[PDB]
């Protein structure tokens, strides 16, 4: 009722514009965290996307997100959105189409942020995540690692950095951890995860503008690969129970799709928000 | 396939080593065509047939076409060096012996996926590095 | 008898403190906002008042509801009448109920274990510079836009003179060490972020005329927290909760620690600052206001000082709280933490008396020196 | 009604450039999926091609695709165009001129996309596709497989991957699945399809430029084989029903051919668009 974790689970390729000056080839770049240089979505972007989804519900938007711009009533929003951090990203493999890549440092940051925010039903999650991390560190013994949790997925190749994923047959992965971190999950060092999510490895697309067969303009766009998983913390202030319940149920309904990103008409940034479950 | 500067330096050293670039920075003009055609031969015929064709020394070629295979082996060996050795790494950092011909090595060691990638990148580096010299 | 609490603020995200230029003023370039490193002490007061009525469940919720004549004096005995009105600076009491004393905001480094809290202070403007004032020979005076002043001589205290191309004491922060000063750069303590913000404006006929702004957000480093001391009477148990400290929904974790009631917080702050004292100086620890700086200049041989700007949001108990906020009638110019006043022979008690005559400011956490 | 699946049946060889400098043999490369690395059409290219087809009907393109690049007013597009992912590809065979190749992972991705987006006829297609996939997994038992559903196609060879397709008699292929996935359909493992769809097995064509009979240049182009099939989602916003109905009728008319990609003057990338038929 105070702090709930939400997972984004993008269905398409996301482009959230950083709006910063460019030194390089890609004219349009995606947002990244200043400290970790990991892809992220600003709280303003999340609030805007969810507000646009709920725009037809005037009362719900007014109660949760607040007054519209250039409206004279000046109503603050009862809901505080926190920055969305990249949890899991798809990674090209050979045994399977892609792999769910979660780095040990992102797991540590998730545990730290769960402890800091005291997320709802996060005690068991923190305990089990810490057991997973401790077992991973025990197996790794300070060396770089790539750990899968399916016996079928052992020996998978991460193409970009050329590392083989081994299966630690002594570490358990609880079902709720599969539901959170993703299916076909590989755990690797942050050294490899940084390479897998830098500006040279995540997709770059060329885009054109044609005028009776004449190319008027040329530029390049970079996007976040689809099926990527991002987590953000929602602080539900002491608000109306009915509007909070309606908003939570609509967000968690599998029929909902939220567009966070730029290129809406060409299907960029459509996502499915899910809140943390028990365990 | 972005330009890899380290592979370009490897290609420069290997081109000088396998007596392609003369003391004056010039090379036989036909080698340009050799490097350009090796990649197409690898792609549309197979790695082993292309290597066998370019490794042959009984050829009616205007120059020593087999020198490019030696340069390829030198670039590949240089890439095997400076490989981050760890338990998880797929890449085999084992150097190709000089007595073994390149065709035999891929025949005896049947993991072509690494060899194919290395040979393709080494050929690209070859073609890009040959342009620093005069095309006599 | 009074009860004293130590309140520590931990930032849960990027924060922002507004300066004189805000994103929607009537001035020219109202799309770039820059963030002050510290909140105003009036923001601390509003924080405490808001949380106090939050615990007692006394707010304004939506229409401009009026309060019956029991909530009125319960808010009187809770917070008082007004915000931090700088008009009543010469009032020998805090104009606020329950709350009696608020220390200047402190930069605290919490590293690991219980250990200790490293209070961080701005560098005095003469860190390794020895000032050698008038060798009294009747010659070579200065006119500081005014009356006589005896020719400061600044040497590198380690000869040459003061070279201003290598002067950087205003970019440094300092803390207690094992008999030497530990110097931390300002950019290591804080991280700056510039945000691009828009209104997507999709609809059909809206005028795309103001749909672009630039916001500056600051982030404290991981092992760094804000803290201050409070004094509360008629004990209202200030509980730990999630707070707001101003600026685009800034969220902080309030931890309330109880200290011994037989302790005034002022000399606790001055004990923290004791490691920066020199007999010939007056180190300005918190922003200092004087109605006439000419008098202060006349009572010193040097003012190695800087200017800071103050503008407060003025709101009463029966205020809208949901409309345009009536900001302070006057922008006030305070000195900067780290400024030093080099008094003449004697007259130290006189400048102390001049500084301490503002009791509202001193109680609020302003005009604190060592 | 919002989300419908459209199948792209290419009538020619398609080339959708990626704007990537290869420096190798194939200078001109085709666009590939961000996560699965399968050939695809970016939604920007799809939108541009379909807009170019409908450029005569200025009202329709203004209402659906939005305002022209040079226009004093800006009008966001109402229809959402999703990227066209490869569904089935023609593979060379011996008994028949070619087979329609689909991988079990492509089928899983199709089922997942229909579940997430809830296409108009999603329920029956998901049910029958899941039954087919479960039967395939039961028959294969974790091995490499190649299954054809006509008994006459038993032992048909795939030329690029020298394997012969078996006939599992237990698994039925429903006629609507045949209409969706293509006639003469072969289902094989992800390894086989990945080898069939990599850069070394896609059709690469050599081209040159002649100046007075002398060759001036020489480059290699790779293309997506003719008769390939791709699927993409179309989500309508608050689009007017009249223009939407005209759009669907003109798009799915058998007389309608759309050019997507490059080399239009040499007949590259001509396609037909058809909706998801009711099951």
As a percent range, the share of helical residues of chain A equals 25-40%
Report the major sheet of chain C.
9 strands, antiparallel
Task: Choose one word for the global shape of chain C.
Answer: globular
Terminal CA distance of chain C? 27 Å
For the record, give the distance between the C-alpha atoms at the N and C termini of chain A, rounded to a whole number: 16 Å
Total helices of chain A: the number is: 7
The oligomeric state is part of a larger assembly
Would you report the number of β strands of chain C?
A: 20
Residues in helix, % of chain C:
10-25%
Return the string of H and E elements of chain A: EEHHEEEHHEEEHEHEEEHEEE
Total helices of chain C: the number is: 7
- How is the biggest beta sheet of chain A arranged? 9 strands, mixed
> Hey, roughly how much beta strand do the residues of chain C contain?
25-35%
Greatest interface and its residue counts? Answer: A-D, 34 and 39 residues
Order of helices and strands of chain C: EEHHEEEEEEEEEHEEEEEHHEEEEHH
Mass-distribution shape of chain A: globular
User: What is the structural class of chain A?
Assistant: alpha+beta
**Structural class designation of chain C:** alpha+beta
The total of beta strands of chain A comes to 15
PDB class: immune system/rna
Keywords: CRISPR-Cas complex, adaptive immunity, RNA degradation, second messenger, immune system/RNA, IMMUNE SYSTEM-RNA complex
Entry title: Cryo-EM structure of CTR-bound type III-B CRISPR-Cas effector complex
Chains A, D: Type III-B CRISPR module RAMP protein Cmr4
């Amino acid at each position: 009722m105070t702090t709930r974790m939400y997972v984004i689970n993008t269905l398409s390729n996301m482009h959230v514009g950083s709006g910063e000056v460019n030194y390089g080839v890609i004219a349009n770049l995606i947002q990244r965290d200043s400290v970790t240089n990991l892809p992220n979505i600003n709280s303003s972007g999340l609030k805007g996307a969810i507000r646009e989804y709920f725009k037809e519900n005037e009362d719900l938007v007014r109660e949760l997100f607040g007054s519209a711009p250039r409206d004279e009533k000046t109503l603050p929003g009862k809901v505080r959105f926190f920055e969305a951090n990249l949890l899991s990203m798809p990674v090209r493999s050979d045994k399977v189409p892609f792999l769910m890549a979660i780095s040990d440092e992102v797991l540590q940051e998730l545990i730290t942020k769960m402890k800091f925010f005291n997320c709802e039903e996060a005690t068991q999650y923190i305990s089990h995540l810490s057991t997973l991390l401790d077992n991973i560190k025990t197996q790794a013994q300070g060396t770089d690692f790539a750990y899968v949790f399916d016996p079928l997925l052992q020996g998978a190749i991460i193409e970009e950095v050329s590392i083989r994923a081994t299966c630690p047959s002594h570490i358990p992965l609880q079902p709720s951890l599969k539901k959170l971190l993703g299916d076909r999950l590989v755990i690797l060092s942050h050294k490899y995860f940084s390479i897998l999510s830098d500006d040279n490895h995540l997709p770059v697309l060329s885009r054109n503008n044609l005028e009776n067969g004449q190319s008027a303009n040329l530029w390049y766009e970079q996007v976040l690969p689809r099926y990527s998983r991002l987590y953000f913390m929602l602080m539900d202030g002491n608000a109306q129970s009915e509007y909070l319940k309606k908003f939570r149920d609509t967000l968690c309904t599998p029929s909902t799709i939220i567009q966070i990103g730029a290129n809406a008409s060409i299907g960029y940034g459509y996502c499915q928000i899910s809140e943390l479950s028990p365990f | 396939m972005k330009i890899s500067k380290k592979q370009i330096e490897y290609a420069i050293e290997a081109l000088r080593a396998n007596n392609i670039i003369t003391n004056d920075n010039q090379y036989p003009k036909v080698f340009k065509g050799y490097i350009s055609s090796f990649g197409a031969a690898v792609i549309q015929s197979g790695l082993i047939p292309a290597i066998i064709f370019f490794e042959n020394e009984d050829n009616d070629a205007n120059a020593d076409r087999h020198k490019i295979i030696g340069v390829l082996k030198d670039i590949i060996n240089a890439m095997r060096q400076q490989y981050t050795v760890t338990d998880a790494t797929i890449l085999v950092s084992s150097q190709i012996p000089a007595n073994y011909s390149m065709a035999q090595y891929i025949i005896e060691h049947g993991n072509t996926d690494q060899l194919l990638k290395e040979i393709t990148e080494a050929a690209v580096a070859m073609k890009l590095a040959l342009r620093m010299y005069k095309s006599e | 008898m009074n009860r004293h609490y130590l309140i520590t603020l931990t930032p849960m995200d990027w924060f922002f403190f507004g300066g004189e230029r805000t994103l929607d003023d009537g001035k020219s370039a109202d799309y770039i906002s820059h963030s002050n490193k510290f909140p105003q002490q009036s923001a601390l007061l509003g924080m405490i008042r808001y949380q106090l009525l939050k615990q007692h469940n006394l707010l304004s919720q939506f229409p401009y509801t009026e309060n019956k004549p029991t909530e009125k004096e319960i808010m009187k005995t809770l917070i008082g009448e007004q915000s931090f009105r700088m008009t009543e600076r010469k009032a020998k009491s805090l104009g606020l109920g329950v709350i009696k004393q608020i220390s200047p905001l402190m930069l605290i480094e919490c590293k690991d274990d219980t250990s200790s809290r490293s209070i961080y202070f701005p560098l005095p403007l003469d860190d390794g510079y020895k000032v050698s004032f008038n060798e009294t020979s009747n010659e070579d005076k200065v006119f500081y836009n005014g009356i006589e002043c005896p020719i400061p001589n600044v040497y590198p205290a380690s000869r040459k003179f003061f070279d201003h191309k290598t002067y950087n004491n205003y970019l440094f922060w300092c803390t207690q060490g094992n008999n030497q000063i530990k110097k931390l750069l300002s950019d290591e303590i804080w991280i700056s972020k510039m945000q691009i913000g828009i209104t997507k404006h999709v609809e059909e006929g809206e005028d795309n005329d103001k749909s672009f702004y630039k916001q500056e957000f600051l982030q404290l480093k991981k092992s760094f927290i804000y803290a201050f001391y409070i004094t509360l009477s008629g004990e209202s148990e200030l509980s730990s909760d999630i707070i707001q400290l101003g600026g685009q929904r800034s969220v902080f974790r309030m931890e309330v620690e109880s200290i011994e009631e037989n302790s005034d917080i002022q000399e606790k702050y001055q004990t923290a600052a004791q490691f920066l004292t020199q007999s010939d100086r007056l180190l300005i620890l918190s922003p200092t206001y004087v109605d006439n700086l000419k008098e202060l200049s006349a009572l010193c041989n040097f003012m190695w000082s800087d200017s800071i700007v103050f503008r407060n949001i003025q709101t009463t108990n029966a205020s809208n709280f949901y409309g345009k906020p009536i900001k302070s009638s006057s922008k006030y110019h305070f000195l900067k933490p780290g400024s030093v006043l080099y008094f003449k022979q004697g007259k130290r008690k006189e400048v102390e008396k001049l500084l301490m005559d503002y009791t509202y400011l001193r109680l609020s956490g302003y005009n604190i020196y060592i």
